[PDB]
Amino acid sequence: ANPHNYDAWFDYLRLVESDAEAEAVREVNVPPIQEKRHWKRYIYWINYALYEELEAKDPEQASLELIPHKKAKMWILYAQFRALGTSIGKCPK
Amino acid sequence: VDDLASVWCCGELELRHENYDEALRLLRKATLPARRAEYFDGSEPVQNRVYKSLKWSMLADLEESLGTFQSYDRILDLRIATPQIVINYAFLEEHKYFEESFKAYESLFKWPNVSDIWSTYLGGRKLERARDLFLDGCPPKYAKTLYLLYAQLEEEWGLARHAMAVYERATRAVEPAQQYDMFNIYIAEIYGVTHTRGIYQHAREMCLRFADMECGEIDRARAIYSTWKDFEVRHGNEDTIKEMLRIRRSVQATYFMASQMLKVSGSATGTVAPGQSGMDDMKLLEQRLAAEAERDQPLRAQSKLFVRSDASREELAELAQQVNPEEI
Amino acid sequence: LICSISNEVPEHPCVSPVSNHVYERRLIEKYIAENGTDPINNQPLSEEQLIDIKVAHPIRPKPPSATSIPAILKALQDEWDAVMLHSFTLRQQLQTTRQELSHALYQHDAACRVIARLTKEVTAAREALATL
Amino acid sequence: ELSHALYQHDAACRVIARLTKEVTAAREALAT
Amino acid sequence: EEREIDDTYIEDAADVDARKQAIRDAERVKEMKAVQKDLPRPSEVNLRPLNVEPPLTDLQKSTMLHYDLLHEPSGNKKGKTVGFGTNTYLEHNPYEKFSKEEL
DSSP states (O other): OHHHHSOOOSSHHHHHHHHHHHHHHHHOOHHHHHHHHHHHHHTOOTTTHHHHHHHTTSOOOHHHHHHHHHOOHHHHHHHOOOHHHHHHHHTTO | OHHHHHHHOOOHHHHHHHHHHHHHHHHHHOOOOHHHHHHHHHHHHHHHHHHHTTOOHHHHHHHHHHHHHOOOHHHHHHHHHHHHHHHHOOOHHHHHHHHHHHHHHOOTTHHHHHHHHHHHTOOHHHHHHHHHTOOTTHHHHHHHHHHHTTOTHHHHHHHHHHHHHHHHHHHHHHHHHHHHHHHHHHOOHHHHHHHHHHHHOOHHHHHHHHHHHHOOHHHHHHHHHOOHHHHHHHHHHHHHTOSHHHHHHHHHHHOOHHHHHHHHHHHHHHHOOHHHHHHHHHHHHTTOOHHHHHHHHHHHHTOOOOHHHHHHHHHHHHHHHHHHHHOO | OOOTTTOSOOSSEEEOSSSOOEEEHHHHHHHHHHSSSOTTTOOOOOTTTOEEOOOOSSSOOOOOOSSSHHHHHHHHHHHHHHHHHHHHHHHHHHHHHHHHHHHHHHHHHHHHHHHHHHHHHHHHHHHHHHHO | OHHHHHHHHHHHHHHHHHHHHHHHHHHHHHHO | OOSSSHHHHHHHHHHHHHHHHHHTTOHHHHHOOOOOOTTHHHHHHOOHHHHHHHHHHHHHHOOOOOOOOOOOHHHHHHHHHHHHHHOOHHHHHHHHHHHHHHO
């Protein structure tokens, strides 16, 4: 409650708190904590949240969520030839 | 020494009276249970050998009066003893009036009551309840009496009176048999429903659920919803209500358990929401395994869905091998 | 027996003539001097409107007992009005028993025609098979 | 008298079960 | 490794068997409310279906001897479903006969 109670102000502050409470949830509603974590990361830095949210997504349906977050020409070419490809397109583009 | 002297007791009366004065002296040392208890058993024994001598019940009443003068549950064992020989004497009720004079004066005598009520049966109900004014085995036994007389509902009442006493520990020991029996009797919903409600404060959930399914069903499912074995059950009953819930159940299940979530997911997407289920199969396979690799390989092989996603899958599982090996 | 304002046993009962209720004179008098009203209904009432409790006049009464003719007549209403409900308990329960008997005798009359045909068919199958 | 009909109602549908068996035993013997 | 689950399942299975016996004991006896009479059964015969229900009444009640206790739920359900198939106009003929018996 104290971890979630830590206010989300701005983008990086809320994303920093997302790292805290997610680790707290992990170590100790598993789906709803992941969903509230998904909205915190998506509702943030927007450039750095592509590598932060997705890095704990494989650990955390999967194909659709990765394509929306990753969304470039070379990435589509790499896909046609599934989590590693979205990671390649997130860091580069 | 009084016993060896008793063995030595031709003036046995002299040794006995000397044992009495010895009681007068030893009493000072006692400032009591086994001392007073043996003192009473021996005094009454002296009146018992006196009884054999026709020398005795009155003096026995005198020594028992000394036991009254003693200054306690063991003393109640003494009262139980004077009452014991007093009933063995041939005046059963007369002694019971005395132990009753003591308790009315107010517990040790109750063990003698269990010694007495056990055969007093061969009406007895109030005789038994007198114990309740002052022992779960005794309780179940008595309820079994009324059951033998088939008072039925009266018997259930007894289990009401027991459980108000012993609290969530002994009460369970009563309550498991009480449930199995009362459900066996009437087999009206609201009364038994309430009875489980009172009851609830693990197996109880199972009896209760067993009741609900065959006398509202969803309500029961809510109750099971309200540990691995317990998860396994619910899933079974939900499957009994039809297939769709069971895939749903696992999602609840996730929060060795991964083997079970895999067990449900296997026929889930395997028979196939289905995309969310397959991606869930990936999320679970990645959740924590060579047989699982055979599973994903089977899912890939099933397509008449791509070597790339498959190699990526083995790559991810290899990454899991990396995170696993990295662990200390 | 009681005063409705205080709840005591009033030692000087005076009954009002707007809201019929027995008040204690000393209590109700102060209620009127506060404001000219009856405490219960809040209707206007003065001290002269209030009237002490009195012996009727010249006809002598006797206390309310079981002998008294009017108390005995209201008793016989209780007897019959209770016995009239006793008849409903047996009229309503008769309409369930005869309704269950009607459906029971119909299921008996619908079934016994099938017992008569099976006693025919099982004996006819024994008459047919044994001859062959 | 309604309760006497309920015993005969349930006693009759036990007697039909034995009569159906005697018909079932007959249909097997006719086939042979 | 089951523990207190076989005891719970045995209590659940023993609970199921009691639910089958009480319901299939008797329709009239289980719902709501006779002296033993072998002479009344002898006088009533002096026709076969009447004697069958008489022995059925003497068996359930247990100058009265008991014996019959082997005559199960599935055969009665198919017997009830078959007789229901054989059985506005039917509602009026039952209401008219009920008024005749009432008179």
